[PDB]
Design a protein around this ligand. Structure first.
Ligand code: 8MJ
Ligand code: CL
Ligand code: CL
Ligand code: CL
Length: 281
């Protein structure tokens, strides 16, 4: 049933930047191109992890390998990537083999559940919404236990508010936003579940992590979703013939919809840092 919502990588290519990054860009400075801003977002994440030469970085949901490659090139670190996409696995192996380094580069076709190797630092960019509510305790325990005393993790995730907080903005918008979230979790990311920032923070604390004030990327996702929407819209004919009018309509609704609800502050995007007790000052 969810398989009906499986879409070819070719489609995403028609609205994403050349890196094919499927997550919030970081427009600092404001007038970066989408491509440059996707690199700036990778740097935002990596710059919080206190990476030193010879450390191993684990990337949970390593995508097309852009984060891992930047990490090797900027920080001279070993990398391990986890992905569930064969196509992403293939791309990543070739991206990493392409790098002129002596550092260990490994990509694994598996989830974090199956990963139990010591690593120094963890990065996870918009993979966490594709886990499940009941999995969050196990995820933070795993991350805590596989890292040394000075371990750090960043998790970037799209975020909803608890029904109670949404009701604070009036019942009309709340029920309306609840149904749009349902649509995303059914047809865009089937079986997904949007966490709250509060959940991301408190599950981290329960596992023993120090969690500073999460960074909001709301304004950067608005700009990202606007460019994605405009780009998909300009490639409508091309997009339709690669999939269907059904799929184009679905994704235009997704992109225009998120832009709207991010603007109305019924959705957020959180970059949460998790510091182990022995993390550097
Ligand atoms: O060969 C096709 C292909 C597949 C994945 C990609 C990811 C990022 C950039 C690219 O050009 C890609 N090209
Ligand atoms: Cl899909
Ligand atoms: Cl994709
Ligand atoms: Cl464990």
């Amino acid at each position: 049933i969810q398989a009906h919502y499986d879409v070819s990588d070719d489609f995403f290519a028609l609205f994403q930047d050349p890196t094919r990054t499927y997550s919030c860009a970081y427009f600092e400075p404001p007038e970066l191109t989408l491509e440059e801003a996707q690199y700036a977002k990778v740097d935002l994440n990596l710059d919080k992890l206190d990476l030193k030469p010879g450390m191993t970085l684990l990337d949970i949901g390593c995508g097309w390998g852009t984060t891992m490659r930047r990490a090797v090139e900027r920080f001279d670190v070993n990398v391990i990537g986890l992905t569930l996409s064969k196509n992403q696995h293939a791309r990543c192996e070739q991206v990493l083999a392409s790098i002129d380094t002596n550092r260990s580069r490994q990509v694994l076709l598996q989830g974090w559940e199956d990963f139990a190797e010591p690593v120094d630092r963890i990065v996870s960019i918009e993979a966490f919404e594709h886990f499940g509510h009941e999995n969050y305790d196990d995820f933070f325990k795993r991350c805590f236990n596989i890292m040394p005393a000075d371990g750090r993790m960043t998790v970037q995730s799209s975020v909803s508010y608890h029904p109670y907080e949404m009701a604070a903005r009036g019942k009309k918008l709340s029920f309306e936003t609840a149904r749009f979230i349902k649509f995303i979790v059914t047809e865009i990311f089937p079986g997904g579940r949007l966490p709250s920032t509060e959940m991301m923070v408190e599950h981290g604390e329960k596992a023993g992590f120090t969690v500073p004030e999460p960074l909001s990327l709301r304004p950067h996702y608005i700009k990202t979703l606007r460019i994605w929407g405009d780009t998909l819209q300009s490639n409508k004919d091309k997009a339709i013939e690669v999939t269907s009018e059904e799929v184009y309509n679905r994704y235009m609704k997704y992109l225009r919809g998120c832009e709207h609800y991010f603007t109305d502050e019924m959705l957020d995007c959180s970059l949460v840092t998790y510091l182990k007790p022995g993390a550097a000052a």
